[PDB]
Amino acid sequence: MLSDEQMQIINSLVEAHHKTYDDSYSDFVRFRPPVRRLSMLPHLADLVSYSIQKVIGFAKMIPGFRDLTAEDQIALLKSSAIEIIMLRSNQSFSLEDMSWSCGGPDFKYCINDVTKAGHTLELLEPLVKFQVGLKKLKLHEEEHVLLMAICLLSPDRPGVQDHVRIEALQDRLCDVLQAYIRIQHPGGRLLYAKMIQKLADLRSLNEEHSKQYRSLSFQPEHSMQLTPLVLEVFGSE
Amino acid sequence: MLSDEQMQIINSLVEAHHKTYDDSYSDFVRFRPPVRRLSMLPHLADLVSYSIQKVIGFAKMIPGFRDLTAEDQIALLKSSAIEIIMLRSNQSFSLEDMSWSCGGPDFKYCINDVTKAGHTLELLEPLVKFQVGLKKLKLHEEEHVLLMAICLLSPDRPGVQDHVRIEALQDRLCDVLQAYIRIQHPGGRLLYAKMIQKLADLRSLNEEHSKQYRSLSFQPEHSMQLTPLVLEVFGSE
Amino acid sequence: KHKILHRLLQ
Amino acid sequence: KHKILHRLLQ
Ligand SMILES: C=C1/C(=C\C=C2/CCC[C@@]3(C)[C@H]2CCCC[C@H]3[C@H](C)CCCC(C)(C)O)C[C@@H](O)C[C@@H]1O
Numbered sequence A, B: 001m002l003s004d005e006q007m008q009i010i011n012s013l014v015e016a017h018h019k020t021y022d023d024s025y026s027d028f029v030r031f032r033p034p035v036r037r038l039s040m041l042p043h044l045a046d047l048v049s050y051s052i053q054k055v056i057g058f059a060k061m062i063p064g065f066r067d068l069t070a071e072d073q074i075a076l077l078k079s080s081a082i083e084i085i086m087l088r089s090n091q092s093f094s095l096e097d098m099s100w101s102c103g104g105p106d107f108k109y110c111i112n113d114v115t116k117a118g119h120t121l122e123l124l125e126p127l128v129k130f131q132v133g134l135k136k137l138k139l140h141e142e143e144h145v146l147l148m149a150i151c152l153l154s155p156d157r158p159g160v161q162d163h164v165r166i167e168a169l170q171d172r173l174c175d176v177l178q179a180y181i182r183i184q185h186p187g188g189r190l191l192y193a194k195m196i197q198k199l200a201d202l203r204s205l206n207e208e209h210s211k212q213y214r215s216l217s218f219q220p221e222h223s224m225q226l227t228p229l230v231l232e233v234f235g236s237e
Numbered sequence C, D: 001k002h003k004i005l006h007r008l009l010q
């Protein structure tokens, strides 16, 4: 059975996600529109930038995160931002399409759109393969949410200073995830292992994005297209 | 009569403006849309940012500008950017409306929209009064264009280093404007004086904008809404 | 440094 | 410093 402390951790992590994820994708009409040079870059920079704001709103609601120093919070968010975005994006990924389907014709992001944002196939190949592995896991919301907070709370990040305290938080959260799968997910004998496997996947995709963003933000006609949030989260300072 | 050298200066300055100003305002569907907190700030930051790109394309076509050092070009553009924008915006200003009418309902920028971008009435009052004084001057295109290049080429800018050389360019251009009015504008006995008067106006509006932008870019939830171009042109570095 | 990220974190 | 403005000016 689950303890009070562990269902409370699940309760507020599910509500935080409900408060920071919109299944209708309505706010997307406020972005710069898509175009199909790097035609998709403005719309996708806006999208990522909006998502960064939602991830921050999630993290401030993970128990224990708010009490870290501001440095460690920044350090955790900069390193883990893109991964939490790849995880959250799974809710929009459809296997029938192999596209993120955030609406009708315009907000259905195919693979040819990711390239039009300046990313080569070295990112796209393991990314979609990650997205169909995550999709086949048929995660409950409690696990999707828990996995996000576990990813965010890795001490394996550059800049983290109190890796001992954040390691304690990350372990309080794996206990919840393991307990939750064991007692509330039938047929999930293998699931925790596969889920942790996916964190190693993300670190690999993270490196590949950073290599391609670094090359992008060094060409001023492209960094021109980024938002300030994006530049601040993905730069080195 | 006008000299060859002076009609050449007029010829390429009119073409430069035709190459950097779109009377249809079609590119405005690529901005972040307007909303009517500071609801209008994203759409107007995009607008200003796009306009900065057009002013740069104009300046690179003013004769003599391309041969200044890159420092003096940056120095001239940073100081004079907002003024060239206030001047170019006159083409969209209508006295029947007192709004910039860049399209239908959405791109008709009233005065209540400028405030929704975070500007107080201390900027708006002399700004529209400037816009109706410029509008009543019924300038020919040769003068509107010439006035812009004269504004851009003021040595009275912070950062300019070769104020002697750019002063020579600005004077080559006032000779063209004076000659042009004298020989090609009937009933313009007073016009050059009034036009130069308007440059003093702009310096006053420039100061008022800078005071209000400075206060805006020091609140990170608002600078968040600016584009990188805007931040780079209007910051101090 | 990181003016925005500090702001968004209250 | 001024990476973009330098770029836009060729
Ligand atoms: C962001 C979300 C959703 C989709 C996420 C996608 C699909 C579109 C592509 C991106 C954005 C991808 C998320 C991560 C993979 C690659 C993305 C770009 C190519 C990276 C550009 C970033 C840059 C320009 C700064 O280097 C929709 C909804 O599920 C909400 C969720 O938060």
Ligand SMILES: C=C1/C(=C\C=C2/CCC[C@@]3(C)[C@H]2CCCC[C@H]3[C@H](C)CCCC(C)(C)O)C[C@@H](O)C[C@@H]1O
Residues within 6 Å of the ligand: B041, B044, B045, B047, B048, B051, B085, B086, B088, B089, B090, B091, B092, B093, B100, B102, B109, B114, B117, B119, B127, B213, B226, B230
């Ligand atoms: C820009 C142009 C046109 C209109 C120009 C206008 C009317 C709308 C308001 C602004 C943009 C004004 C130009 C200058 C006065 C005030 C403007 C904002 C309030 C300043 C915000 C800048 C910030 C946020 C960085 O501090 C339309 C067409 O004529 C093309 C032309 O280039």
